[PDB]
Enzyme design. Structure first.
Site, mmCIF file in Angstrom:
data_model
loop_
_atom_site.group_PDB
_atom_site.id
_atom_site.type_symbol
_atom_site.label_atom_id
_atom_site.label_comp_id
_atom_site.label_asym_id
_atom_site.label_seq_id
_atom_site.Cartn_x
_atom_site.Cartn_y
_atom_site.Cartn_z
ATOM 1 N N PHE A 52 1.283 0.473 4.465
ATOM 2 C CA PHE A 52 2.719 0.351 4.659
ATOM 3 C C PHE A 52 3.230 1.462 5.571
ATOM 4 C CE2 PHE A 52 7.068 1.444 2.922
ATOM 5 C CZ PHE A 52 7.721 0.369 3.517
ATOM 6 N N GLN A 53 3.853 1.068 6.674
ATOM 7 C CA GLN A 53 4.411 2.012 7.638
ATOM 8 C C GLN A 53 3.435 3.036 8.213
ATOM 9 O OE1 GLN A 53 8.161 3.646 5.758
ATOM 10 N NE2 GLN A 53 8.978 2.090 7.171
ATOM 11 N N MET B 162 21.708 3.215 40.363
ATOM 12 C CA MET B 162 20.525 3.522 41.148
ATOM 13 C C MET B 162 19.760 2.258 41.544
ATOM 14 S SD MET B 162 19.066 5.890 42.709
ATOM 15 C CE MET B 162 19.393 7.542 42.108
ATOM 16 N N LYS C 225 1.326 12.279 3.538
ATOM 17 C CA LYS C 225 2.197 12.463 2.393
ATOM 18 C C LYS C 225 1.546 13.152 1.199
ATOM 19 C CE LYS C 225 5.404 10.198 -0.704
ATOM 20 N NZ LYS C 225 5.975 8.946 -1.252
ATOM 21 N N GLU D 253 15.672 8.320 15.731
ATOM 22 C CA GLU D 253 14.612 9.294 15.984
ATOM 23 C C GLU D 253 14.570 9.688 17.460
ATOM 24 O OE1 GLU D 253 13.443 8.799 12.910
ATOM 25 O OE2 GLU D 253 13.764 6.648 12.590
#
Ligand SMILES: Cc1cc2nc3c(=O)[nH]c(=O)nc-3n(C[C@H](O)[C@H](O)[C@H](O)COP(=O)(O)OP(=O)(O)OC[C@H]3O[C@@H](n4cnc5c(N)ncnc54)[C@H](O)[C@@H]3O)c2cc1C
Ligand SMILES: Cc1cc2nc3c(=O)[nH]c(=O)nc-3n(C[C@H](O)[C@H](O)[C@H](O)COP(=O)(O)OP(=O)(O)OC[C@H]3O[C@@H](n4cnc5c(N)ncnc54)[C@H](O)[C@@H]3O)c2cc1C
Ligand SMILES: Cc1cc2nc3c(=O)[nH]c(=O)nc-3n(C[C@H](O)[C@H](O)[C@H](O)COP(=O)(O)OP(=O)(O)OC[C@H]3O[C@@H](n4cnc5c(N)ncnc54)[C@H](O)[C@@H]3O)c2cc1C
Ligand SMILES: COC(=O)c1ccccc1S(=O)(=O)NC(=O)Nc1nc(C)cc(C)n1
Ligand SMILES: COC(=O)c1ccccc1S(=O)(=O)NC(=O)Nc1nc(C)cc(C)n1
Ligand SMILES: COC(=O)c1ccccc1S(=O)(=O)NC(=O)Nc1nc(C)cc(C)n1
Ligand SMILES: [Mg+2]
Ligand SMILES: [Mg+2]
Ligand SMILES: [Mg+2]
Lengths: 582, 582, 582
Positions: free
Chosen positions: A121-122, A485, A171, A59
């Site tokens: 859930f999630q 760096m 959803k 993602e």
């Protein structure tokens, strides 16, 4: 004009409405990774024939790809993720797009409305989590709102100061059937009433007046001028004022021009910072006076009248108090000042020759430099060669660190949207995904990701995406086996005491680890390594000439230091002009 | 007792105080990735001789590694990141640790205090961003508070319901010199006053009373019993009650026992869900009645008295109303009930033979199964073989999806903290990093990451970490070229309409892409592929026997479906017992 | 059925839609004070013929009046205010209604939407300010949402655990013309899915089982039983269990009954607290185990099985862990248990005579008492006389402090909604306005505000409202020249060191100041003062008999102390049974 795919009376799933909402916005590409809470959206996506999806491998890759797309096209970048871990994986990308003012619309699936807040859930309170790192966000609570919200999100993401907007879609709403109303008016009374009006002539004239009254004028151009390339160019030829640029502004004005002072700031050219230090008039166009550029505010442009033109009133007077300000589109302000300058030309007779020369001596006494050791490849030189062989017409994305600074210093960008780099947040792993988005947005362009070994490995999984999507992404990996760096700072301020900055294997200190060539091989991407400066030119040429994706692993000595350098909160008098880790 | 490294009167940097604060907490391992805002901390770290740092290749890898460490040891996991992108990259890990109640302390560097809120270089309001996804967090505003805050963070992270705590440390405070006071009292009046008192005998006896009054009792054990392995075992031998387990509870009670009903829920065994469906007494110990386990709450354990023992009062009665509740440590409640059961043994004479048999018929009529096609490798079988060759004594970490479910179904965990899997958030890319942490916490154990091709690639860069750190991490990659779990749902509910679920290359549909073996090769990790079930046993054996890190790429037919399956919000009567994607 | 006042096709102002929304909800009375941001609403109000407005003299008066209305009728109380100072003046009322679970809908005008957040004339972020002190609130952003939001607000305010809901209405939306849609569905998926289902028989039977198994049962009735007067009564006659009540529960069960233990808690009767201290079964119905009642939780009902029936799951197990809980409507649980008790009557044969007697001895050895000094009026006695002359059929509202406690102790409420007192927040100045609302809601009832001199003066301006509205409000002012409750604490714990608790004039220590009779006179309300206990009965009678508003200033000796008293966080063994400020 717009031909739908459903009968105006026929109800369809909220998911299908969401997709048409995108098609109606002109969206052609989205970077979406499927998950439970977003299955419906992905299904609706396959029904679309105008939108193509580029499935990333993470993602974060999706967001950064969307950023690259946006940064390289001027269009908003669209990424989609599922709920929970999908959504949280976008976080760095949103923060990045917000700090750099990149137009972006992120859509995340959510658990069903009745499940919200129940530790389902999630599920993650993504709207709450991202509130401080997005320009604005939404939680759709009714399928009826999909059209309006999507329209509002794109409007907000692209108007004023561009930024990211996240839309959370439960959803159950994706599955709900309904008949969309594309006529709904947006509910942005406050925002729309605050949108800057075109600049007033009185204001623009006081500026032209100041310009004629100055002897040492300096342009301080930033990311806000990305769409004013032409206006800015014309402005400079009518005033003959030298142009200094922020890292975000690179390309707004051709770095390869005698009037160009190049980049200013911490790692800016000695002459660019000099001009600002000794200017009597500072024209801050599309900049936000960041600590990277100003150092110690009191000392920054301490002896000059500051004019600041910004589209965000919240920025005017945030770190520096201007003597003259203009809250509006810099592109319009330039067009206005150009007319005035064009007319009162004769009565003005602007001549800053003395100033330009006073600077050209600095540009000559303190030019950007790099040492060459034996046959070791100088990263700066490699980039310089890339510039030559690509005729400075390539789109360059980068990681964060020394290579990033060199990619900024040693490459001449002809136009804006050629430079894709994370400046505000400075997020590593940005280069490869950004290149993916840039390539999709610019199928004919030469896309080169100048990466670091540390940054490259963070999102190395996107190599799979590059191959499967068949994108001609070239990777110029400046491999120095360290977190450059940070090691530079270890050398300057910590007696070179290495603290977890070595990225290679301690068991084989002299072996290049890992073998980036094999990461490429794993995803069927041709690759080659270079160690001798002598055969670097041929190597890069091969990379460019070889059709499709290509990885060139360029080995560099790690003791290199980015110069010059003005330590944090420092003055132009604290500028470090020499030294390395040897 | 504790020997410092600075004179009690000698002032040291806040960073050094922060590190000693960790040493005083008993910390030996941290997973830290250096960045600008955290350089001081990393420097202080090198001065420590008791704390070892495992430098990951991505901050997300760092958190997940810390989770693995915690989940496998019972100790808190410590990760450190720099500001901005460093900090944001921890987000998924924090959300994960919060949903699964994993003790974790995350430390992030911040820009100097005076720079906060000014849109400074690499600054993100991390405390604001993470407030809803952490058990608690802090922004240190004075070096004087380092000792107290660190002590408070560890206390909060480890006590009550374990969870993540983030401590934001401004850079200027890391550099400030001071003399620490380790005697400061914690400021947690509210929290400490709310900590559950040990269970009352009256309560525990009413439970034993209910047990004797029941005919169909069923234990519903979850993640809350991870430290009550022994207490639980003794309890079961004194009552002879069958044990059903959540995905988080696996191992609390040996899956390889006749009294074991194994996992229940969406993908739970038919007999486990049956027992709950027909139980008259449900003993919910250390569980949170998640939708994954209950389905339709009304139908869940609809015909039985529910006893719920939880350490978090907020959970008791959240989704299901118990008939009896006990807010406290399940380990203590078990010890108490064990005494009672041990004494009133004779007068009790508990016998649930009839119930166990009624269940053993179900366990026999509907056992876990898997079909074998030709010489194709059945993922279930591979895991079964791994179990055999490791004698179920290996620590197993996993990704998310079908393989995760199979790793749960076809492996018998002897003890808790052997199963490391993201259950609440279900974050992909967890398996490999988690294994890293588990291995560091358990140098002598066999650590196997049973991953999916989709999940594995997300944090594939951690392979570099595994090699450089020389960890004997074994990777059993169940490669099915797809996002399995999602494709299964595509088959069952979307007429097998593939929507971005194929992870291979469409140009060579039959070629395994990518070549995971080469990712291993790139990081000098021996690897091999297996395609025929016949030589799978020898392959796995090799992986196990080959000293050090090892990747076994196991190719599986993608049409496999996890069974059985109770659709979302469904009933035990909606359980799907057959079918696949063929 | 509902006859509008506008053609179904005719557009009207949002303000007019808001008012019809109220008429459609059955609203007949509102307490609104006009202001700039709410002029439109007030204009729309005058067009209504079914809704009457009671214009208070202070917005706080408006809210408290709305509370009185609600508390005395069971209907929601509606108050309306303008923006800025209008809105902020409602704050104490909202907090009050939230802590006492009083159904209330507050509507506030706002500045035009485009003006929001600009520091506009009379604007305050009321939604942000009141978020933590209301059950829920809204900011209307579109005239189209008026119907839905108003319906949702009333639904939320009246369902589940009643509470206040604030609706913020921008002025531009009040003026916008539109055609309302009264068919819109409410968007409360989460809330509505969480609403408790009717109690299960298994649960209710386990309770009846516990009742039969107990020897010392005690009912702990609170504000949650206000609508279960009959169900509760029947329940008590089927079980013969003594009834203890919280301050919020007074009246649910007649205080004048041999089975009544009266109020428990800090200032509860010795016998009520005794019964709880020695009960083996505690039936907590509609209570929230407040510190005022429990004292030291460990010691509270330490030797008994606790059954807790509440409509708010968040309350079950918040301070005390029950042995049995039921999340649902107590009214339904009682009806269910009544049937069971009614059937298994014979086989049950419940007899708690021994327990009741053990208590009746306490009720006789430690009854509520008060000393009488010379001809000084004992506040307790005055209230007792009021009770007698009104035959305990009056609606009593009160201020906060000693008088409040006495009004609770020495008056027998026959039914619920007769007692209107601020218990959770304990806000002074509540009595007079509350009486106003109660009188409007009950035009035929006897409404008496038993106030304190300190509380009465805070909202004395509402006397103007009482007169102009011609409400038969009687004020029984128990004037003791001090902030009684606080001075009592000064005496018990601060060596009677007076610290700003004297409300009279130090220049004339012996003169009653102020002269409340003149406040009454100013608003043309007949009033009289009483100083001798001998002519108190005639005085009160006059007040009652005199038609219309009436103020009886009752002078009392200030050294009176409310008894008995269990110090904060104390035990039943710390109960103070004697003493005063002499
Ligand atoms: C390792 C590292 C080193 C760095 N070193 C340097 C360095 O030495 N020098 C340097 O310059 N930077 C450096 N940076 C980048 C730096 O952090 C800042 O991102 C950059 O200085 C910001 O420049 P900017 O203000 O011009 O652009 P932005 O941050 O993009 O800000 C643009 C501004 O323009 C305004 N604006 C936008 N659109 C319009 C419009 N149409 N009309 C008018 N105004 C508009 C915005 O609202 C805003 O205020 C470094 C970053 C890293 C990671
Ligand atoms: C693809 C996928 C499929 C899934 N399928 C299933 C499935 O079919 N079946 C299934 O079970 N799960 C499944 N899950 C996992 C699921 O999401 C939940 O994570 C899991 O059911 C939670 O179980 P738990 O409540 O027992 O543990 P936790 O979530 O860890 O909750 C433990 C509880 O115990 C309490 N507690 C903690 N310590 C103590 C103590 N000392 N004493 C007393 N109480 C304590 C806590 O505070 C808390 O309420 C799946 C996840 C994924 C990713
Ligand atoms: C000076 C002063 C002294 C005080 N002294 C005392 C004292 O000595 N004794 C005392 O009792 N109080 C005293 N109080 C009042 C005290 O602060 C609390 O307000 C009171 O104890 C709360 O009682 P409650 O829990 O019964 O009612 P509420 O606070 O109204 O709580 C009712 C509860 O019932 C639940 N419920 C609501 N509706 C339903 C339904 N239909 N079915 C099931 N459950 C439902 C609610 O959600 C909630 O949990 C005093 C206050 C002041 C100002
Ligand atoms: C995140 O899920 C929710 O949104 C979610 C969260 C809580 C309850 C119900 C849902 S759901 O019933 O609407 N959808 C799913 O449960 N989906 C799903 N589940 C698994 C296990 C694997 C895949 C591919 N999809
Ligand atoms: C994130 O930085 C800040 O905290 C931060 C943010 C705004 C102002 C000042 C600081 S600072 O002066 O305290 N530290 C640094 O600027 N550090 C740093 N900068 C670069 C460019 C590369 C490396 C390795 N470290
Ligand atoms: C609170 O006002 C605003 O809502 C408000 C706030 C900022 C700008 C515009 C308004 S407004 O133009 O919509 N209404 C008024 O200005 N009303 C008003 N003003 C005065 C001075 C006296 C009275 C009675 N009404
Ligand atoms: Mg490097
Ligand atoms: Mg897979
Ligand atoms: Mg008084």
């Amino acid at each position: 004009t717009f031909i739908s795919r459903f009968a105006p009376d026929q109800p369809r799933k909220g998911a299908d409405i969401l997709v048409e909402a995108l098609e109606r916005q002109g969206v052609e590409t989205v970077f979406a990774y499927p998950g439970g809470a977003s299955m419906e959206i992905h299904q609706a996506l396959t029904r679309s024939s105008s939108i193509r999806n580029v499935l990333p491998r993470h993602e974060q890759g999706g967001v950064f790809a969307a950023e690259g797309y946006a940064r390289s096209s001027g269009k908003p970048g669209i990424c989609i993720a599922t709920s929970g871990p999908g959504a949280t994986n976008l976080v760095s990308g949103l923060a990045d797009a917000l700090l750099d003012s990149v137009p972006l619309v992120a859509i995340t699936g959510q658990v069903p409305r009745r499940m919200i807040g129940t530790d389902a859930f999630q599920e993650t309170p993504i709207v709450e989590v991202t509130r401080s790192i997005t320009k604005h966000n939404y939680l759709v609570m009714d399928v009826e709102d999909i059209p309006r919200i999507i329209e509002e999100a794109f409007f907000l993401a692209t108007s004023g100061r561009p930024g990211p907007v996240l839309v959370d879609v439960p959803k159950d709403i994706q599955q709900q059937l309904a008949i969309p109303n594309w006529e709904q008016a947006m509910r942005l009374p406050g925002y729309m009433s605050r949108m800057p009006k075109p600049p007033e002539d009185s204001h623009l004239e006081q500026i032209v007046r100041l310009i004629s009254e100055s002897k040492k004028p300096v342009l301080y151009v930033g990311g806000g001028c990305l769409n004013s390339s032409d206006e800015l160019g014309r402005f400079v030829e009518l005033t003959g004022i030298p142009v200094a640029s922020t890292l975000m502004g690179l390309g707004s004005y051709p770095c390869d021009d005698e009037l160009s002072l190049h980049m200013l700031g911490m790692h800016g050219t000695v002459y660019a910072n000099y001009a600002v230090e000794h200017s009597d008039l500072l024209l801050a166009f599309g900049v936000r006076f960041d600590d990277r550029v100003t150092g110690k505010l009191e000392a920054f442009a301490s002896r000059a009248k500051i004019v600041h033109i910004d589209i965000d009133s919240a920025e005017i007077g945030k770190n520096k108090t201007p003597h003259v300000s203009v809250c509006g589109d810099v592109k319009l302000a330039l067009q206005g000042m150009n007319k005035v300058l064009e007319n009162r030309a004769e009565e003005l007779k602007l001549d800053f020759g003395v100033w330009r020369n006073e600077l050209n001596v600095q540009k000559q006494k303190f030019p950007l430099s790099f040492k060459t050791f034996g046959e070791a490849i100088p990263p700066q030189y490699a980039i310089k060669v890339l510039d030559e062989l690509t005729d400075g017409k390539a789109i360059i994305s980068t990681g964060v660190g020394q290579h990033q600074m060199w990619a900024a210093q040693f490459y001449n960008y002809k136009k804006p949207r050629q430079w894709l780099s994370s400046g505000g947040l400075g997020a590593m792993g940005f280069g490869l995904p950004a290149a993916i988005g840039a390539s999709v947005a610019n199928p004919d362009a030469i896309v080169v990701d100048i990466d670091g070994d540390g940054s490259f490995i963070m999102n190395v999984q996107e190599l799979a995406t590059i191959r499967v999507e068949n994108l001609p992404v070239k990777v110029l990996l400046l491999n120095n086996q360290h977190l450059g760096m940070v090691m530079q700072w270890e050398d300057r301020f910590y007696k070179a005491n290495r603290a977890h900055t070595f990225l290679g294997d301690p068991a084989q200190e002299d072996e290049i680890f890992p073998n980036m060539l094999l990461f490429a091989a794993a995803c069927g991407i041709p690759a080659a390594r270079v160690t001798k400066k002598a055969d670097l030119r041929e190597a890069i040429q091969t990379m460019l000439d070889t059709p499709g994706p290509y990885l060139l692993d360029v080995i560099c000595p790690h003791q290199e230091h980015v110069l010059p350098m003005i330590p944090s909160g420092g003055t132009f008098n604290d500028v470090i002009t020499e030294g390395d880790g040897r």
